[PDB]
Amino acid sequence: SRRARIERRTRESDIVIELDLDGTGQVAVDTGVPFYDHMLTALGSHASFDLTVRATGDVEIEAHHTIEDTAIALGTALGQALGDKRGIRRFGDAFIPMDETLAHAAVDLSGRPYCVHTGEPDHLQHTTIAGSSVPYHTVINRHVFESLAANARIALHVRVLYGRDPHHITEAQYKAVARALRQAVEPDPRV
Amino acid sequence: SRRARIERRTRESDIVIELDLDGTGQVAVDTGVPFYDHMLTALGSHASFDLTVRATGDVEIEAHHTIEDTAIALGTALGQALGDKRGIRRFGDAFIPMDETLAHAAVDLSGRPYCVHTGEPDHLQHTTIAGSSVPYHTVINRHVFESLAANARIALHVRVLYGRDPHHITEAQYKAVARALRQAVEPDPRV
Amino acid sequence: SRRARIERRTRESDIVIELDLDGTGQVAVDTGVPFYDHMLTALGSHASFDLTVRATGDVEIEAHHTIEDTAIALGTALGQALGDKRGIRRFGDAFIPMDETLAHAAVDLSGRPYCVHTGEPDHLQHTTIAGSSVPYHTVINRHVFESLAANARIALHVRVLYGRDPHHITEAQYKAVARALRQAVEPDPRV
Amino acid sequence: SRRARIERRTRESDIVIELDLDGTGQVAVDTGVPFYDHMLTALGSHASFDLTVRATGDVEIEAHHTIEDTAIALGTALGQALGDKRGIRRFGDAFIPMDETLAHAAVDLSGRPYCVHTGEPDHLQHTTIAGSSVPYHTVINRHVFESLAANARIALHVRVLYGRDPHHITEAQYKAVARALRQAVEPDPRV
Amino acid sequence: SRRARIERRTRESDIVIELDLDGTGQVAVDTGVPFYDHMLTALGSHASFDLTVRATGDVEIEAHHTIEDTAIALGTALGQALGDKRGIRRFGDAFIPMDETLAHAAVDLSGRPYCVHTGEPDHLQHTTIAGSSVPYHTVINRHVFESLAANARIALHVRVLYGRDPHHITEAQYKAVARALRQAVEPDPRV
Amino acid sequence: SRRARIERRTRESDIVIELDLDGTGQVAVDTGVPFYDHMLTALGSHASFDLTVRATGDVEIEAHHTIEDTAIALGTALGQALGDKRGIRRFGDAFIPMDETLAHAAVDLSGRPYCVHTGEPDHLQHTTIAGSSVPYHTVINRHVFESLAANARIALHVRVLYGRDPHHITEAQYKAVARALRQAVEPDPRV
Ligand SMILES: N[C@@H](Cc1nnc[nH]1)C(=O)O
Ligand SMILES: N[C@@H](Cc1nnc[nH]1)C(=O)O
Ligand SMILES: N[C@@H](Cc1nnc[nH]1)C(=O)O
Ligand SMILES: N[C@@H](Cc1nnc[nH]1)C(=O)O
Ligand SMILES: N[C@@H](Cc1nnc[nH]1)C(=O)O
Ligand SMILES: N[C@@H](Cc1nnc[nH]1)C(=O)O
Ligand SMILES: [Cl-]
Ligand SMILES: [Cl-]
Ligand SMILES: [Mn+2]
Ligand SMILES: [Mn+2]
Ligand SMILES: [Mn+2]
Ligand SMILES: [Mn+2]
Ligand SMILES: [Mn+2]
Ligand SMILES: [Mn+2]
Ligand SMILES: [Mn+2]
Ligand SMILES: [Mn+2]
Ligand SMILES: [Mn+2]
Ligand SMILES: [Mn+2]
Ligand SMILES: [Mn+2]
Ligand SMILES: [Mn+2]
């Protein structure tokens, strides 16, 4: 049984995460930031987690505090659900083509936080993905992955090999992180 | 049962493909272009497909029309054999060292055609691999992969990380595409 | 049963290797070069081999002859334990993040020796990792992998994508080679 | 008596080599690739070997598999004929001018395979030498020398100092390798 | 009879050399610097000298004084054993491949000291080869060859054509100097 | 018996050459150009030829016509003395250190004239070596070697690897050509 429920309340946001590592992709995400909900839904589904996230935060300022606090809490939930990590594969990686984009992630569930994020085109440091609700600044992608690795206490390396569309580039990275985790958390039949 | 038989007749060529995704490498290829037969035999075997290809075409002009038409028909056969794609891994990738060459392919069985082919040394845009029969112009490698992805309706990304011999460089790419497909078409035990 | 015992005596060193490909990481290494013992222990464990190495050699000169002779003998033991290679996956690869470092290895158990080692920062050609016993010159990493591939008769491609600490850079490569071998030697359920 | 007979049958080719190191240049070569026959005849004659090679292979694809398999088998025959290498010169080198070309080879019969091939003009990576039979792609020169060194288990270093004509450049290298071997295999009157 | 015994005592070191040019490789070297003993043992053996060297010196400072004084004394012993040089080949050269390294030396026994040492990679000016005893700084290679040429009163040209491992690069040069001397000191059957 | 006597009379010069390939260095040269006499005396001695050259020519103009005509006649004498070339080594090369200079020559007694002369420092295209008699312009070195190769009908490749003094640079090349010829003309005990 590899489950964790994390509640995180700050002046800026209120988060509840329920996570099961051995899920089948039963995912419900609601953070008030719909493009981030979309990315975390991709992450939960492609990782084959069961995952509920409910977050409310100060989106009148912008999405950053809610996005970061949610990734902190999700990271904590992952590190708590992994427990002593006995018997698992520990290493995982995945390539994700998404039309013109190719992204990759590799993970070591080592207990030492580390994140290296490389290759994202420079226009992503000032791109906004905007719809009819609160927008998502793609500069935050790096912060999401760093907050995840820091609080799960894992090494997470995320690379964009190439790509052009900012939604494809973002979504392929969240998917790659998701499939890398899925491989690394699985029981290893030889250990 | 994941099988397709495709017949494609044009003014330029006559093709029959019989494909089974759940094969054991039972492969017979005859296109009149023996180096291409060799590459498609590698592709069928390393993908663990059962695959028969019989093609006749206008090789007095050169191999291009037969090669492209065969890849179009093979692509169509793959997309037809995959059917609704329920329950499969969907993503697959593979590295293939071949002496000095290292190639890689990643696939997303997404239903949207896309191909990105990168890294092949520039001398491959005018190299000929010639024996005692119809020769094979390595410039056509890109067209084969694009025609495969376009007609199977999948994302296919093929990279040459490095290499020198044009037969190794070509053959390592066909093998990589083959092993990437093999992983992506397999049933996924968690979906 | 995929086991080999190799004894190799030269003027410079005396080596005994006992290797089992189908092990569970039962590893004991003693070469007189403690950082190399550490790397070969990583290699045996991450490959899920059972592996005993006992080497004594001319470390008053420096570690090179003992290190190389041991890798030659270990390579021979691998190629002997693999036997006719019937029914195995044959290809294997692995990414290994280790804090700031990311390394990768890909293997083809082809029967033709080949090694390509790329990306290691230039300071590793004159770095020493020194403790209270015989030191380890990281310039030797390349020679270890080449001697392994040459005597097992396999293609081994080892890459450092990036990194800074010489112990992380070294150890991530030995781990990557180890996990790539583990994948490639495994029985392939479809062949 | 320093003789070896090697038979090598693969799906791609059937090879028989009979080699005598202490010959007088009695050489008969028939591989189905007449420019390669010419180069191996040069090699056998300039090395003062007696050498018979008979190879048949899949030249409808192109010459590569027959060429490589023959060099593998010839390498094995050399390493077998050298036996324990007692009493020989061990090191050998030779310069070969051939009109505008100057090539060189150096050998160490060390028991550790190694090949370094440098200086060949870049146009040789896509040059074809074509007559009325199966052609020879000069990109294969490097692969021939590497396969020879790998299977004889010797260090072979081949350099083109300069040159322009691809037949002179190729033939001067095979001659240089041949004369370097001839010197290195000879009995050394002081050991 | 071409023999010399040289004793050289300084405040820093005490050296005894016994040299025979017409030897069979009977070599015993003990200087307190085991990697240097290894190189001088290579030099004596590959030159087909009989050579005893016994040196003790101030290795608490470092190896330099013992290494240089020994090469001075060995040079003097060579120049004394050559005597009037009547009837010898006088010129000698040798290429030495050592895995990835290729080194070369040429000699003229002219009676005028000269040394030109070129091609050694720049990292060798600050590389240490260290084991469990006194280490060897590869910056000293040049000084060894210069001291040898200066005291034997010969022209000695040592080149590294290419290479990477500092032990291979060093050892291939000492071997090349050794085989070049062996050729040059031999009786010339036509003079 | 490998001897030739050549007389060559032109409006510009009168030459007599007597050459024996199987000599012991009995050399007498008198051309009216004393530095050229010195170089041809080096050439005859280091080649172990017996060689008499007596030339008189229009040195009031400068040395060029006498120097070139003598090299033409000497070349003709070499090609005539070699006869059918049966049973000889055919290939020869030699390195010649001369203080700071290192030169090299390689020869193929092929019956096709060819000369490639490379590496000589650019100041040699306008250097004069002057004493109390007729001077020698070092620009002529290339013409001497080309005239030798053209009239003996051999491939001659002469290289200066490095050097500074024009007399050392010149003399080391003539010596290298001489020792390369000496090796190439010798009977080959295996053919
Ligand atoms: N919410 C955290 C971190 C943060 N605040 N603004 C942007 N990032 C804090 O208040 O320090
Ligand atoms: N066969 C197709 C595509 C094609 N024709 N020549 C090269 N490529 C056509 O006729 O358009
Ligand atoms: N031990 C082997 C290889 C080697 N020696 N020094 C460094 N590498 C030999 O003696 O040739
Ligand atoms: N014949 C060998 C090597 C090779 N195949 N194509 C080019 N080189 C094999 O099948 O792996
Ligand atoms: N031993 C000699 C030369 C030397 N001293 N330190 C480094 N080299 C001397 O005392 O001058
Ligand atoms: N002596 C020959 C060649 C020559 N003349 N001046 C420089 N070189 C002739 O008259 O052509
Ligand atoms: Cl990659
Ligand atoms: Cl050279
Ligand atoms: Mn923040
Ligand atoms: Mn989307
Ligand atoms: Mn087309
Ligand atoms: Mn092939
Ligand atoms: Mn070594
Ligand atoms: Mn460690
Ligand atoms: Mn090949
Ligand atoms: Mn020819
Ligand atoms: Mn000093
Ligand atoms: Mn050594
Ligand atoms: Mn002229
Ligand atoms: Mn002089």
UniProtKB/Swiss-Prot annotation, chains A, B, C, D, E, F:
Alphabetical list of Pfam families matching this protein: IGPD (PF00475)
EC main group: lyase
Cofactor: Mn(2+)
UniProt binding sites for Mn(2+) 2: 64, 68, 143, 168
GO BP annotations listed: L-histidine biosynthetic process
Annotated EC: 4.2.1.19
Subcellular location: Cytoplasm
Pathway participation: Amino-acid biosynthesis; L-histidine biosynthesis; L-histidine from 5-phospho-alpha-D-ribose 1-diphosphate: step 6/9
Keyword Amino-acid biosynthesis: yes
Catalytic activity as recorded in UniProt: D-erythro-1-(imidazol-4-yl)glycerol 3-phosphate = 3-(imidazol-4-yl)-2-oxopropyl phosphate + H2O
Residues at which Mn(2+) 1 binds: 38, 65, 167, 171
GO CC list: cytoplasm
Molecular function GO labels: imidazoleglycerol-phosphate dehydratase activity; metal ion binding
Binding sites annotated in the UniProt record for substrate: 12, 38-46, 64-68, 90, 112, 167-175
Swiss-Prot/TrEMBL keywords: Amino-acid biosynthesis, Cytoplasm, Histidine biosynthesis, Lyase, Manganese, Metal-binding
UniProt KW Repressor keyword: no
Regulation: Competitive inhibition by 3-amino-1,2,4-triazole (e.g. ATZ).
UniProt xrefs under PROSITE patterns: IGP_DEHYDRATASE_1, IGP_DEHYDRATASE_2
Cofactor note: Binds 2 manganese ions per subunit.
Family: Belongs to the imidazoleglycerol-phosphate dehydratase family.
PANTHER family in UniProt: IMIDAZOLEGLYCEROL-PHOSPHATE DEHYDRATASE, IMIDAZOLEGLYCEROL-PHOSPHATE DEHYDRATASE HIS7
Protein name: Imidazoleglycerol-phosphate dehydratase
